[model samples]
Target: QFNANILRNGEWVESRTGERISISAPASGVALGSIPALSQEEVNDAIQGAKDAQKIWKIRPIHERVDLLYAWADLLEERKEIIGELIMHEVAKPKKSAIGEVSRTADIIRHTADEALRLNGETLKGDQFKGGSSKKIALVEREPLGVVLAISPFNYPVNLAAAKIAPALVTGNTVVFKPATQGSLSGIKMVEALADAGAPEGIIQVVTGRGSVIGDHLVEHPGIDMITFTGGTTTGERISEKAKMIPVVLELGGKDPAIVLDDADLKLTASQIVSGAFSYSGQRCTAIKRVFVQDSVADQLVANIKELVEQLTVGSPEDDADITPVIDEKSAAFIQGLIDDALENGATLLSGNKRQGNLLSPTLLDDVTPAMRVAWEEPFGPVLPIIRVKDANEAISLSNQSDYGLQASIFTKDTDRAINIGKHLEVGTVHINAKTERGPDHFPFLGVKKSGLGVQGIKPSLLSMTRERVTVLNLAENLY
Candidate 1:
């Protein structure tokens, strides 16, 4: 068993409070550890410490910060295996993916550091706007947002947590982090790596506690300058309400659709769709949840998808199954409800819908209609739904109607047709001849509608967590 501690004032402090939140593995039902439900006073001190530390840390030369970030990334890489093992048991993620999460997080940190090094300010002459003197000039530069509140979800614990913290740190902001209850054990280890790499005291504080106790207080607190959170849509909405005037970058729920045209290659389409939907048990916000294939090819596509999805292994994290258990019993039960609703509403179950404990086999549904709950609601499990459409326009129309505008996939041989249909789809990203996913950390990733608020790539994240500061210069005469 492992014991997790909260980070305060650059030190790891074990919780003395008798009240605690226990954690366990979804795959094996094995006990992991527990976190202290911190008192309001402790939480306030952490926030205050972060605010005080940010003032001094922000003034440090960018290179010095970059060096610390680089060292942090290196340290993470060195301990990837240990952290990966914790993620496997904590979140029920497979061994390879758990390890990959840590490595990728390190890459993101390095890239963010590189981007910060290249961050430049602009000099603007007032005369450029017309009717102004050349002597009047302005220097516009980016400045940190002071204290940032970063909340990460259970899925992709290490990667998502670092995604927010690294950019905030490189851009000169201090972060108060709260990892999901299930993934907190692994998350704490990642933070430790940063601290061991020589991070300044109080620069990054981890507050481990139940959301009910500290969730609202953290967001509603006036000390927080900005907020970045990745979780369910409902919680994101709640944060938006509480964090009134504070800037927030929210990555919420998504039901990404795969729009397959009649001319799409069924073999390639099936492989991409299955991999996108079942990888990590379809827990990703960008995972392809539903398919809008043209009627002419719907049957063929469904057959191929069923065959590929069945190949995914369903077992425990220790076995490194392709499709493992979900985060908890509640999530598994919720997914079952969606499955039952679809089956009752005339949807055909083409593949697995078997559930044992928290373990749910990858399920494939065909001939699903708009009336079914699975057609609209995000399952966040290894479940795929197929909805046949008359043509590309129909597919595009249906895809646009979804409340989620995170991402959409277009599979067609004709680049022009794919591009045309993609143009009409109301999503942040459109993948041609591919499946929906988030990658190439530098690419801009965002969502519209209820899916998310604000952009998240490396540069965009760095920019969003900070504001531009302008210094105006008034001169007596013009040189030109």
Candidate 2:
């Protein structure tokens, strides 16, 4: 019931003799639609489409870019329900979370446009600097980096697509938007809405196909100026191998942590972590994967949290379920395997440890350690592993041991001390008295050790997808 053709120059056309891939619903594995994969020739055509329009698009005044982006944002609000439903089936995101994801996508568009206007390229009149010299002018600007290739993630198909596409457009660059095959229908429709919102063709176009088939082809092309990608760290690492020296912004996943101190509010902390760890079936990169509770209150906190997890509904996204099936059966099996491994390694399965079809029970385990694969590896599903730490110092030490440093949270009554410990978290963002959650769109979101390459959110994201340049002019008549 959806068109899977590539969106090149504002037109939906078939690939040059590529196979038609089926887009399936996660809950039942039903075929929703079949979209054709763009062939090698079609891929180059789409890239050329962006190259043709980027120069013209970039020079067409910032006001036009801002206006079109605002229109795109407005259109997203009207189509939220439609896209929200699409997300529910395709990605198996619960209805509430699906709607929120659609809303967040619109906000990304609005914020990108807002940031574009206030991008502040700083005009150096020479009057505000050092010796107060006269008749010298310097202009600092963020220039569009020609053709940009953006690879979207299945976990956040629409939002991640909008996250990269909107920023690249607002910064006066063109994007060859490539969505994950798992969520291509809705992702293609997302580009459709932007096109309907009056974004000029080629400024943003969608090319659909298998990542393995056309992924490296797109990255290795000499025409691509930069790359913006959001997916697993393994794929990101592969992209690094192919696109050497190309400017890339990679948001690899994280095994985020939440530390609870002895003096922390038990009920509030439990509630937040339950929602954080199990929400969206824990598909979010910033979702909590591990909980390190202080020895003094670990028992009490674990009891409260397990009780909450037991109450959560695990069903289809169409229903008002607290959780649903992950992206696919493979994901569910992977999560289940990790849970089984942890249990075999002396970890106690306090709550769930079952799976039916693709729907997995929200799992919780206790006495987990860094030595176990479950402790260090990112499940990226609704499985929470709790580890006991002797004190806040030990908690911080344990948290920093992970290779992923995306986001973490510290729960304590001492707000001052929580902030103090947060500084050493080795993560992009640290939340006090909250869960390992991400943002309100404007925060500087990035990973330190290996979580991410560039940044996300609105302001920093837009500024980063583009580059900087300085132009100098001397008006002094007395020239050499």
Candidate 3:
């Protein structure tokens, strides 16, 4: 049986499993084990524990928070191997990708240290309101908002969880993390690492259960001061609606597009496309889901990608497979349905529709139009849909036609054109001369429209999780 651990009030305990749920191995499509689903009462206890802990945590010195974050980073590094193994087992991610995710978690903690140090506000001088004798000085400082609920997704579980947990803790806000059900093992390992690094009891808690059972209560509970969610737009909207007066940060879905201009380096572009599109089995939110190639190079690029896709070896995550399985069989079936719909709608399957067990081979589709499901929807799978466009303007227009606007990229050496497209694109993040997979912790990362609500990263996420408090002082008051 897969025993799920609940971290509450600084202790790890297992919930009673009245209704046991079996977890399947994506690699073999076999029943791996069973885990007890956390009941609503248990979830309530976790929430109450976090709410109680926040009062003390929020008053702690910034230096103490920084020390704890740095310790967490060190412990994560020490346990990186075990965490990678857990990620591979739970999420079916390749060892390399899984390792990178764990390492990135450590990097995030280090960035959190820098962010905590810089969380102070600016000092104001006397303004025009106090002309001569009277003077007022204001300081705008950032403070924690009680309890924050973080809901992270399956793909890149460690990295994304760190994106929320590290910032929340460093900013002196207690957290209740509800990790993706598909990534429960990695989530447990994450909590263990934090505890080993000396995180205060109940400052950060992990509750493992289905979204239906506990997600709404976590968001709607009056005790939760804010909600930071990472998932689909539909789910994000639901969380937002239930948030009421509390603030919500949604890192929702994306249909990121990659445009390759004629002047771009074909070989470099082809390599990046293959890596960015197929890496992690194309399950990442920022994966190059759609490709818009200039007509001059469209056919050649498609043909090249087809050859590369065929060369990839799809197999089990533990077996040194070139491409690991999707999150589960259900996700694989969903992707197949999308591919089938696209084929029915006149989209040509250039290569790959082969599904053995839980592994879906990296697939490529051509002659795709906006009418196809793959065109308008976020296909979180190993499918790459390519569209031919006349020029860069058409490419930008076609990309912007979607309701989601998370991220997009342009592959071109033309500096002026790339800059112009970057400036004009409606997406939150635009990459020039590269694929859409790149993101740094220092810069703000988020989406526009239905994609998400607020930004995240190192400094930006810390700012997002806290509220500003102004402090006014009168230096000359000593005279009174």
Candidate 4:
């Protein structure tokens, strides 16, 4: 039996069921392992443990936490291959994509380590009490928000979890990570790496179970000070509703658009579209699900994208396929349903719409209109729907109509046009002459509108995971 464990108080233990469920490969339907799902009570215990641990941990030196994170980085680098395979087994993503996530995870740990070392208190000088009084000196420092519940998604599980876990730990906050039920093993492996890197017991914990049951309990628990969630918009809203007093940093769904102007380099645009759309089977939150091209270059760009997308090979993730299976058969059916709906509404499939088992081809659709659901919703699969626009203004307006304002991009050589469109785009991050998939570890990343709430990254994420406390000192207080 392949059993999963809940890491609480720095120890691993089975769930209340003492049983495990089989994890099946998306493509071959092969059983990878039996993972354990925690119950509500176990999740509560983990949250309590994190809260209790934070009381002592918050006072520890930041350097010590940095050291622990550096150790974790070393351990992750040493186990990259093993973790990559494990990620594929559970998450049904290409091995290359999994390796990239592992590498990015290590980079995030190192970056946050440097940030922890530079964590400092601010000094403020201001006038005291009344008119002619002495100057008041105040020091403002960041403090951990006690227990943090990090709810990671199935796609890009490692990198997203690291974005939350690394910064939280570096800032002296204990984290109770609840990875996607479909990708629990990768989460467990990460916790093990942390423990091996000298993290103190109870500093980091993992709770795996149904998102509704355990996720709701973790978010609603008074002991949890904050929540860092990345998933669908609907689920994120539910979390927001349950989190009464605790704060939440949510990175929800995105219907990102990639704009290709007439001045764009056809070769670069085609390559980026293939990579941005097909990577991880288009399951990434920042994937370019929609492409808005100017009418002057519309046909040329569509033909190029279709040709490049056709060259991509689809198979099992373990086989090093260019495009792996969509998370499951149900998701495949959902994508197909969307395609059918679009076709019925006068949309054209320019490239692909074939599904063999869990493997869905890199599909492209042209002549897509805003009236269709696929135009506004996040088609989290290997489907790129192209819409023709008159110019940059129309492109920006069309992209901003969706409720999701996560990320958008414009492939243009004109600096003036790029700046204008970027200023007008409603998304959180806008890329110029590039795709939306390239996010730096040091930069802040989050969404706007229904996409999400607070930000997550190196310094910004660390700042978000903490609250400020001010201290005032009086020079003449000895007399007062």
Candidate 5:
């Protein structure tokens, strides 16, 4: 449904070095097609183009910029199926999840459009931030921070791209988007949507190549003003250290947890955990990597989850499968290795733990202890590691002990206790009655510790991508 294209500096061009990478199905190992890989020189050219265009793009009227964004979002709705199919083929995402991301991108853009309309300066009569004085007037305005380098992961390419791109452009910053090589076509389709909708050139650019080749050069380059990355913790650390003066927003890995209390609704709890833990073949950073249940309901919750896991249908992405293959066989093997360690350490497999190529069936490991390697490691696959906790306090402690602090969920009857528990959870976002995998497009999506360096979602991202500029006027008849 999407054209075999790579957009750089608002123009579709073949790779300068004529490099192409195969786009294949991870499970079937079949080459779907190919996307161009940009060389260092091509990337440098794109950066130069962005620098030149950003100077002009940033000054364009705010209404004009958001109008194009709204139009771009309209195009996404019309081409949702096409974008969905592209993601389904490239990343082995389930059909529903794939289309949901396409639609989510539209909501992301629409919300950013509303924010763009609402973006304004604030007048200050007297305040602590202004060193309060009754006789003075001050204004605080948000301004674009020049060019931005947006790096998105493959799992949710369409939504992640919009999550960064829409807000960046709306706030007057130009973007040089670098999509994961695994799903370049998905990013291309998104950029194509904006171009077809009459977005200006250089305002939005995409580079299709391995980050290993282009990551360092563009990240450390003086021309780029900021870097917004979404991937792993190790990569985030590397960029965090290297991009010295350039500000960054890194949404890294997460071994997120789900805490189920005895008073929780077992049916809804089990089903929600099953869906959150297994959806997208558990490739998301926000996926429930582990579960900590109150000992009182451990037995019944385990049985409930095992039943739901047994009913899961995992296969190729072609058949409208419930759970599709992971990114590749290597990922499958890595997850398998962790499962093997857990099983060898007396962790019982209550449901499926079989792997046939990249398609691993839904896996549930019961009686998982903290001693097992699976407890410490993040198995970004269709697997769940459950540990019995004495109570909600233990659950919160165990969840905070991990190196990651992305998102966490709690299943409980009392809202007051849940909210109180959320205050000390240590993660960025908490869901009281739902799963950890939640994105409403407008809320502040963030992560604590090594999980992320900054917040995202429409408004927070706008603030992240831009900075504040304050202007003050001295009163004529000042009473200082």
Candidate 6:
């Protein structure tokens, strides 16, 4: 009986078209809610509205914008429980993690506001360069990129959406947000919090529908000044091609790897790897997808991992299981496809590969080879592959050969050797004796190759959504 409405012109409005897109819980397959299936013309108008709003908003005083953002963050924190429940029901993310996303999103907004105040301009004299005039000066500053089209993924609907929206809004830009189909209700509630915090008409808008219907129109719209997307690499590539001159920040897919060296502490390493791989059922872009262990320590590491995987609880989100169902039945089937392909190609199953509907037990594969598709592709489910390599060099080579270069983990006692190996890895971020993850909230997160296109995080993301404008002035001749 729940219906999520779209936001337009500062008001939550039901779609004009009777058409609606239904959402279902991945764990129970029960109907969760429905959102408007907006038409192309409606989407066009929404973009136009955002473009118009940016004109007035960009001229506001910085502190005024800051106050509004703080208020928005307050509202988010206030409504966390209600919003968290929506997340749990819609995406089947466990209650604890779902609540954490809402809380973290609020922190991101608060931090973005604090950073915006610290963002400052610099003055440079022309005399710095040889033979330049002494009386000339330039003031370089950051300015908004006008309207931002923020597209978020289902895996982290609340957190990822706020990551894009908060930066764009605090930096004086209007936004048109598009949440993933599965998590639209949760996203809608987040936007509602902002609107209730006194956001002006068209200052932010939410549009919902099938991407195939209005996706290209939003990307190609002349009014969209920049695009921030988090989704599949193929969709990102298509958006990039269509976006053309408009700047885009794409946080795409990943096949992040964990490399365990011979001297690594297996007990600690095993615990970190298990949490990294199966947390939220391995649906994270930064999730450790594959493991490469030194031959001497391979058996020990596998045994340790097997012991931990057996302890994980698998059930519905309401039950707060460690390994909940994936986003949908189709994704579950795809993960099974990869698992089947690996088994057929000679990979040995070490542990759970059992499935009941979309709730899959955490599966562990051993003796995984490069020839097997599971070794190369991203499962985005609770499937971990252990590949045994003779030495560090072989592990490094196999890890770098993958098309994705998002993040890589190294577990070893030797800091010097860990750093030396890290330097040879192709990924964007390398962790030492730790698991692969995206936080601390401000650290720069990016990827090389097909993993992603641009950097993310507070500073990098805020900078990406803004442009530098310099004002040059000629002082009086006597001022030299």
Question: Each model's TM-score?
Answer: 0.98, 0.96, 0.95, 0.96, 0.95, 0.98
- Tell me which of candidates 1 and 5 scores higher on lDDT: 1
Query: Candidate 6: global Cα-lDDT?
Result: 0.91
lDDT by residue for model 6 over 292-374, one digit each (tens)? 99899999999999999999998988889999999887899999999999999988999998999888999999999999998
Selected candidate, larger lDDT, 2 vs 6:
6
Pairwise TM-score winner, candidates 2 and 3:
2
Clashes of each: 0, 0, 2, 0, 0, 0
Query: What TM-score does prediction 2 earn?
Result: 0.96
Please provide, for model 2 over 149-209, each residue's C-alpha lDDT reduced to its tens digit, 9 standing for 90 to 100. Answer: 9898888888888888888887888999888888888898788888888878788878888
lDDT of 2: 0.85
Which residue pairs in candidate 4 collide? none
Candidate 3 Cα lDDT to native: 0.82
| lDDT of every predicted structure (CA atoms) | 0.90, 0.85, 0.82, 0.83, 0.85, 0.91
Poorest lDDT segment (10 consecutive residues) of candidate 1: 14-23
lDDT (tens digit, per residue) of candidate 3 on 1-480? 355566878887777656645666666555655555788888888888888888888888888988998888888888888888778877888877787788888998898887788765787766635573345777889889988898898887788888899889888899888888877667778878889888888899888777788778778888788889888788999888877998889888888888999998877777778888888888888777889999998888887788888888888787756678888667888899889998999888888788886778888889888888898888788998999889989988988888989888798989898988877788999888677753677878888989899888788888888998989887575654
TM-score, structure 5 vs. true: 0.95
* Model 5 residue 147 CA deviation in Å: 0.4
Better of 2 and 4 by lDDT: 2
The candidate that achieves the highest lDDT relative to the unseen native structure: 6
lDDT tens digits, residue span 1-480, model 4 = 245676889777877677565676666777777666678788778887887888788788778888889999889988899888888878888887787789889998898989978888987766644563365788899888888888888887778888889999989899988888777778778878998888787889888776565666777788788888998888999989877877788999888889988899988988887788788888888878898899999999999998998899988888889888888877888888888889999998888788887788888889999888889878688888999999988888888888988898889889787888888898889887777853787877879999899887688898888899899886566654
Error of 2 at 171 (Å): 1.6
Q: What value does the lDDT take at residue 67 in candidate 1?
A: 94
lDDT by residue (tens digit), candidate 5, 1-480: 233667777778888687787787676666777877788888878888878888888888888888988899999989989888888888888877788789888988988988988877898875555568776778899999988999988878888878888898888888888988787888888888899999777787777776678878877888889999998788889898888787889998888888998899989989989888888888989878899999999999999999988888878776778778889767888999999999999998888888777888888898899889888787888889999899988888888889889998899998899999988898989988888864776778988898989788778888997888998987677457
A best-first ranking of the candidates according to their lDDT comes to: 6, 1, 2, 5, 4, 3
Off by over 4 Å in 4: 128-133, 477-480
- Model 6 / residue 279 / CA error / Å: 0.7
